[PDB]
Design a protein around this ligand. Structure first.
Ligand code: FCO
Ligand code: F3S
Ligand code: F3S
Ligand code: F3S
Ligand code: F3S
Ligand code: F3S
Ligand code: F3S
Ligand SMILES: [Mg+2]
Ligand code: 3NI
Lengths: 513, 63, 322, 322
C-alpha cells in the first residue's frame, strides 16, 4: 500500500511522508520537505554579518541555535577573540533555547500523539489522554506554558526570543547586569522546580542524572510513586506498554557536532580547535564505533533533492540552485531537503542521525576532558535496547536535567565585571565554520566571506541530516530508515509515521531554509 | 560643557571626507570675459545647431 | 471563534513567539477565550487526510472560519505556481486564496506574511510576498482591495517575529467583544501597538536625547544609544517593543542590540547589503542618512549639536551597570 | 541565610510589593534560595512569646542573623523613647539597635526605613527616621558609621514601596554568591537598580526630548511627558522603574502618573506642600525650578527651545492610543 501523508504536521514546517506498507509495516519511506525559502541564496552578496539576522529566521524554535553557530562562523572566519563571558552567554542562551524546545516540542508536538486511538486498549491510555491531550492535557498545559521560561533567560541576555541577533563576532552585544543574572537564575530555578523536576522527573535533576544504565532508568521509574507518575516515568511506561521502544530505530549511526564551548578553550575560535573546546562533545558514532567529528567530511547530496547538482558538495563549495519540483520529480527528486552525508572511513558517505540521541552517544565516547560531557547512559541504552522512538525521546528529555545544570553553573561562572565583547576586525576575506547542537542536533554554517561580502553561505541543519532524502547511492536518510519498519495500524491515521518523524523533533523550516 | 565642545570638535577633526588643495586662478581681469561672453552669445544659437556636425567631426577624431 | 493558522514561507518564529504568550498564555487563549484553534501546523493534532478535511471544510465554507492566521510568506515561485510551498496537496498560495476568501478576519502574523519579510529579500528565490503587501507596496498576494468577510483588510501583525501580545491581545479583543476597538494604521497594523516607536520606552532614549552613542557591543552597551553607531532603527520603527517588553524581560535595544526595524515593511532594511548591518549609514561620516521619523536632517542635526553641547555628565557614563 | 524582617513605622507596602515578587516569586525566594525567613510580622507563624524567643535569640547572638530587613521608620517619639512603636515588649528602635548590631547584613527596604520617608514628613509626630539616613542626611538612627558584620552599611532599597525586584534580586545575589557584585551608591542603594533614572525607559522620553507636555490627566496622558505640567521627577530620580516594570506591567510614568521621586531620600519632595502635588514648580511660569539631574537651567532651557522648534509632528499627537 502506497500511503502519502500530507501534511505531517507538528514538525515545524511542511513535511509530506510517502511510505510503502506491506503487511502493516512500512517497507520504504520518502520524506518530502515541501517548502523552500532559499536563505542561502539570499545571503549571497549580503553583509558578512547578515547571517546573524537571516539565519535565526531559518527557524523560530531553533533560531537562537542558528544565531549561535552563525556567530561562531563569523568568529572563526574573522579569527575573533571571544571573552569568556561572551562564550558563557552564548552557551547559556543556546542551552536555554534547547531547554525551551524540550518541553515545548515534547508536549505540543510529540506527546499529543500518545492520545491516539491506536492506544485506546492500553491500560495507561486514559492517563495518557488526561496528561497529553492537546491544549487540555494536565501535563500539556503546564509543560507548554513553562516552556517559555528558559527563553525568558534568553531574552534577558539577548533582548528577545525568538529573533535576537545579539551573538556577534567577538562576543555578544549585551552587557548583563547583576539583576539580569540573578533573574536568569531565578527563572531557571523556577522552571527546573516547576516543570523539569516536579512535572517531568518527579525527582531532582541530580537523581535523574544518576541513571547510568537502561536498568538504572527502569529502576528509577519504579523507585517511588513520584518518579513512577512523573511525565518521564509515565512516558517510559507508556512507551514500553504501547511499543514505542520497538520501532523508529533508524540508521543507528549518529552525528554530533557538539556545542557549549568551555570559555577558556575557545577564546579564539578556530575550526581546528573547535572539538577540544566543546563541553557537549562532538562525535560521530558509526558502525558501533566512535569517530572524531570533522566538518571536512560533510557533503551535501542533491540527487533526490530539488536542486541542481551532480556530486556531493562540501558546504564550503556548496550550492543551492533550486530546480522546479515538477522537473525534479520527473528526475526522481522528491524533497527540498538536501541529503547531508558524512564520510566515515570504511563506510563511505553515510547518513548520520543527528539530535539528542546523537549527542548522548557522543557523550558516551571515551577520553572526555574534564570540561566535557562524559555520560555512559546512552551507550548503555543503545547496547541494551537500541535506538527507537522511545530511546530518541529519552535522549532529548535526558538533556533537560543535564543542560539545566550546565546553564546554572554557567550563570554562576559569569564574571560580570569582565568583558562580553572584543571588537573584531571585520576582514574582507574569511572562511568560517560555525557549529552548534541545536535542540534537534548538529547545526552548521560554512561561510565564505569575500570582498567584504558573503561569497558563500551554506547551512546544514540537523533535520536536514535526519530527514534529507536518499543520496546518490539511494541510501535512505535517517528518518526515512527510521520510518521503515514502523507498524501502521491505521493508514487513515498513520500516527506511527508521526511518532517516528516527530521523535527526531523534525524541523522542516530548518531542513530546507 | 568644555569636554562636550572638545568631543564635538574632535569629531569634526576626524572629518574623513574629500579635500583638494588648488590655489592659482590669476589673469581673469586680463581675460575679456565679457567680450568672450558677447562672442559666445552670438555664437550660442550656431553652436547648439552645429552640435551634430561637431559630433561627426569629433567621431572621426576618436579613431 | 474558529481559528485556522497556516504557515507559508515561515520559520515558525511567530508561532514560537505566540507560544511565549503570557496574559493570556497560549493555552488559556486557545481554551478559555472561546477561540477554537481548528488547526496549526505546529500544534494541530490532525495529519494527512484528516487535516486536509479540516482545511477543505474551511475553504469551501462547510464550516465557519472566523480567523485565518497566516504566518510566513505567500510563496509563488516557481513561475507563479507556488510549488516551492506545497501544503496538503496544493500550492500554499491556493490555500491562502481560498481561506482568506473564507475567513471573517485574516491576520498576517510576522513580516513574512505581512510584507514578504526576509524571504522576499532579493533575489527572492521563493517568489515570496506578503498577504496584502510586498514590502511597503500595498497589494501583496491578495491585492490591495482584498477584504475579509468582516470587511477588514488583512490585519498585519508585523515583526520578525511578532511579539506574542501583538497577536494575543488582538485575539482577546476579538474574543471579548472589542473588535471595534481595533484601529489599523496605513500598513494595517494595530495602532494600539504600532503608534509608538521601538524607541518609545527604550532605556537609551536619554542617551539619544543627548546624542551619546554606544560605541561598542558588550560592555560598551552599558551606556549610550545605538542609533549613531549601530544603525538602531528605533526612532524610525513603529512598535511597542520597549513598551511591551519581549519575553516580559527586555527588548533588543535595552539589551544593546539595535532595532532592525522589523515591524516596518521594508525589513530587512537595505536588504542587509554590505555595510548596513549593525552600522549607521552616515553622510560625510557625521550625518545619519536616516533621521528619526518626522524629523529633517537640518533640524535634527542642529538639535543634535545643541544636545551634545548641553549633555549632562551621566549621559556620558555607564548607566546599565552591574 | 537567616532573614529577620521587622516593621517599624511601616505601612507594609514594601512587604506587599515584595510579595508581588516574580522570578523569583516570594515563596521560591523563601524556600528554594536558602533564605531562612526567621520571622516577618506579616508572614511569620510565631506569635507572642515564641516570636519574641526568635527575636531575642537573633538579638543576643544565640542564633545567627544573616540579613536583618527593616521596613518602616525607626520611630523615636515620644521624647526619644520610641514608645510610639512598641514591638514585642520593647520600643522598636531598641530591637533595631540589637538586630542591626547582630545582623551580617542590614537592609532597609522602603524610604521609611532608608530615609524616614512619609512618616518623617513634618511635623514628624512619630519622630521617625531612617536606619542610616534622615532624608538625604546620612546617619539616621544607626549613625553614619554603622556597619553590619559583613562590613556593609545599611543597604538602602528605597522606594515607597520598593519594587519587589529591588530586594529580591539583591537577596538572590546574596544567596547565589554574588554579594560581591552588589555595588552601592552614595545613598547605599544598589547601583544595579539606581544608576538609571525613572526616566530611563519611560515611554514618554521622546516627548521629553521634544519638550511636548502632557497637558491633562486621563486621555491627556495619551501623549506628552509629565515633567512640565505634573511635576514628574523622573529625570531627577534614580530608579529602574521604567527598566524593570512594576507588577511586570507598567510604571507610574508610563501610566500617566508623575514620578514622585520616591526612590530619592527627600521623598516626599517639598513635603507635599501646597502647590507641589502633581504640579511642576516653575520660575516665571515657564522655567522649571528643578531641571533634570546634571543639567543647568541655561543649557536645559536653550536645548528645550531648540527641541520645541525641532519637534516632529508625532511628538505633538497621541501615541498611547486605544
Ligand atoms: N534544533 C533545531 Fe533547527 C533543526 N533541525 C536547527 O539547527
Ligand atoms: S519570525 Fe519567521 S515566519 Fe517570517 S516574520 Fe520572521 S522569518
Ligand atoms: S533610544 Fe533606543 S530605540 Fe535605538 S535609537 Fe537609541 S537605542
Ligand atoms: S527589530 Fe523588531 S522586535 Fe522590536 S526592537 Fe525593532 S521593531
Ligand atoms: S510603602 Fe510603606 S513602609 Fe514606608 S517606604 Fe512607603 S510608607
Ligand atoms: S520622560 Fe517619563 S519619567 Fe517623567 S519626566 Fe517625562 S514622564
Ligand atoms: S515615584 Fe518611585 S516607584 Fe518609581 S516611578 Fe518614581 S521612583
Ligand atoms: Mg543548506
Ligand atoms: Ni528549527
Amino acid at each position: 500500500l502506497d500511503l502519502f501523508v500530507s501534511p505531517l504536521g507538528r514538525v515545524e514546517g511542511d513535511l509530506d511522508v510517502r511510505v510503502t506498507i506491506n503487511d502493516g509495516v512500512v517497507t520504504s519511506a520518502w520524506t518530502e520537505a515541501a517548502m523552500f525559502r532559499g536563505f542561502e541564496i539570499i545571503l549571497r552578496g549580503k553583509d558578512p554579518q547578515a547571517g546573524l539576522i537571516v539565519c535565526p529566521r531559518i527557524c523560530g524554535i531553533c533560531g537562537g541555535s542558528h544565531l549561535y553557530k552563525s556567530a561562531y562562523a563569523l568568529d572563526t572566519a574573522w579569527r575573533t577573540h571571544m571573552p569568556p563571558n561572551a562564550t558563557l552567554i552564548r552557551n547559556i542562551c543556546q542551552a536555554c533555547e534547547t531547554l525551551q524546545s524540550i518541553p515545548r516540542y515534547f508536549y505540543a508536538l510529540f506527546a499529543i500523539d500518545l492520545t491516539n486511538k491506536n492506544y485506546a486498549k492500553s491500560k495507561l491510555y486514559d492517563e495518557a489522554v488526561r496528561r497529553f491531550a492537546p491544549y487540555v492535557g494536565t501535563s500539556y498545559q503546564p509543560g507548554v506554558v513553562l516552556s517559555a521560561k528558559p527563553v525568558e533567560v534568553y531574552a534577558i541576555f539577548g533582548g528577545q526570543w525568538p529573533x535576537s541577533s545579539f551573538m556577534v563576532p567577538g562576543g555578544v552585544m549585551s552587557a548583563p547586569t547583576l539583576s539580569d543574572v540573578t533573574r536568569a537564575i531565578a527563572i531557571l530555578e523556577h522552571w527546573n522546580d516547576n516543570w523539569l523536576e516536579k512535572q517531568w522527573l518527579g525527582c531532582s535533576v541530580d537523581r535523574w542524572l544518576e541513571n547510568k544504565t537502561w536498568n538504572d532508568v527502569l529502576a528509577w521509574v519504579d523507585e517511588n510513586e513520584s518518579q513512577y507518575n512523573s511525565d518521564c516515568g509515565f512516558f517510559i511506561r507508556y512507551c514500553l506498554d504501547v511499543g514505542l521502544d520497538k520501532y523508529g530505530q533508524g540508521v543507528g549511526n549518529y552525528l554530533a557536532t557538539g556545542t557549549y564551548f568551555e570559555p577558556s578553550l575557545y577564546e579564539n575560535p578556530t575550526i581546528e580547535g573547535r572539538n577540544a573546546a566543546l563541553i557537549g562533545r562532538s562525535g560521530v558514532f558509526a558502525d558501533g564505533r566512535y569517530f572524531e567529528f570533522d566538518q571536512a567530511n560533510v557533503t551535501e547530496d542533491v540527487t533526490h533533492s530539488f536542486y541542481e547538482g551532480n556530486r556531493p558538495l562540501h558546504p564550503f563549495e556548496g550550492e543551492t540552485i533550486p530546480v522546479n519540483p515538477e522537473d525534479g520529480r520527473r528526475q526522481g527528486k522528491y524533497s527540498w531537503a538536501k541529503s547531508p552525508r558524512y564520510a566515515v572511513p570504511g563506510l563511505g558517505n553515510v547518513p548520520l542521525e543527528t539530535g539528542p540521541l546523537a549527542r548522548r552517544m557522543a557523550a558516551s565516547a571515551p577520553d572526555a576532558e574534564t570540561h566535557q560531557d562524559d555520560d555512559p547512559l546512552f551507550a548503555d541504552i543503545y547496547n541494551a535496547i537500541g535506538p527507537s522512538v522511545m530511546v530518541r525521546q529519552l535522549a532529548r528529555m535526558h538533556e533537560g536535567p543535564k543542560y539545566y545544570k550546565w546553564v546554572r553553573q554557567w550563570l554562576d561562572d559569569l564574571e560580570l565585571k569582565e568583558s562580553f565583547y572584543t571588537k573584531p576586525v571585520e576582514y574582507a576575506e574569511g572562511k568560517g565554520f560555525g557549529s552548534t547542537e541545536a535542540a534537534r542536533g548538529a547545526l552548521s554554517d560554512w561561510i565564505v566571506i569575500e570582498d567584504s561580502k558573503i561569497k558563500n553561505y551554506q547551512v546544514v541543519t540537523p533535520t536536514a541530516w535526519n530527514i534529507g532524502p536518499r543520496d546518490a547511492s539511494e541510501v535512505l536518510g535517517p528518518i526515512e530508515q527510521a520510518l521503515v519498519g514502523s507498524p501502521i495500524v491505521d493508514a487513515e491515521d498513520p500516527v506511527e509515521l508521526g511518532h517516528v518523524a516527530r521523535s527526531f523533533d523534525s524541523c522542516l523550516v530548518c531542513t530546507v531554509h | 560643557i568644555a569636554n562636550n565642545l572638545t568631543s564635538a570638535i574632535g569629531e569634526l577633526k576626524a572629518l574623513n571626507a574629500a579635500d583638494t588643495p588648488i590655489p592659482a586662478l590669476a589673469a581673469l581681469k586680463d581675460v575679456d570675459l565679457a567680450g568672450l561672453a558677447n562672442s559666445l552669445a552670438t555664437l550660442s544659437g550656431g553652436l547648439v545647431k552645429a552640435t551634430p556636425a561637431l559630433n561627426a567631426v569629433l567621431d572621426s577624431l576618436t579613431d | 471563534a474558529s481559528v485556522l493558522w497556516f504557515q507559508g514561507g515561515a520559520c515558525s518564529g511567530n508561532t514560537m513567539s505566540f507560544l511565549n504568550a503570557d496574559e493570556p498564555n497560549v493555552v488559556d487563549l486557545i481554551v478559555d477565550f472561546g477561540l477554537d484553534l481548528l488547526w496549526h501546523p505546529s500544534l494541530g493534532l490532525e495529519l494527512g487526510n484528516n487535516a486536509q478535511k479540516v482545511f477543505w471544510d474551511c475553504a469551501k465554507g462547510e464550516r465557519p472560519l472566523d480567523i485565518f492566521v497566516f504566518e510566513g510568506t505567500v510563496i509563488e515561485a516557481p513561475n507563479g505556481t507556488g510549488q516551492m510551498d506545497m501544503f496538503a496537496g496544493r500550492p500554499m498560495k491556493d490555500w491562502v486564496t481560498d481561506l482568506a476568501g473564507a475567513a471573517q478576519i485574516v491576520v498576517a502574523i510576522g513580516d513574512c506574511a505581512c510584507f514578504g519579510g526576509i524571504p522576499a529579500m532579493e533575489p527572492n528565490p521563493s517568489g515570496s510576498t506578503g498577504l496584502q503587501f510586498h514590502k511597503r507596496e500595498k497589494g501583496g498576494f491578495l491585492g490591495p482591495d482584498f477584504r475579509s468577510k468582516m470587511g477588514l483588510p488583512v490585519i498585519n501583525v508585523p515583526g520578525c517575529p511578532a511579539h506574542p501580545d501583538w497577536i494575543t491581545q488582538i485575539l482577546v479583543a476579538l474574543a471579548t467583544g472589542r473588535a471595534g476597538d481595533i484601529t489599523l494604521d496605513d500598513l494595517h497594523r494595530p495602532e494600539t501597538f504600532f503608534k509608538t516607536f521601538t524607541q518609545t520606552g527604550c532605556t537609551r532614549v536619554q542617551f539619544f536625547e543627548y546624542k551619546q552613542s554606544t560605541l561598542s557591543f558588550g560592555e560598551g552597551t552599558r551606556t549610550g544609544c545605538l542609533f549613531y553607531e549601530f544603525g538602531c532603527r528605533g526612532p524610525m520603527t513603529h512598535s511597542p517593543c520597549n513598551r511591551i517588553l519581549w519575553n516580559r524581560q527586555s527588548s533588543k535595544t535595552r539589551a544593546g542590540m539595535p532595532c532592525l526595524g522589523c515591524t516596518e515593511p521594508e525589513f530587512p532594511h537595505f536588504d542587509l547589503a554590505p555595510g548596513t548591518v549593525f552600522k549607521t549609514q552616515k553622510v560625510s561620516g557625521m550625518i545619519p542618512k536616516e533621521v528619526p521619523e518626522g524629523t529633517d536632517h537640518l533640524t535634527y542635526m542642529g538639535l543634535a549639536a545643541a544636545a551634545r553641547i548641553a549633555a549632562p555628565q551621566w549621559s556620558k557614563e555607564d548607566m546599565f551597570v552591574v
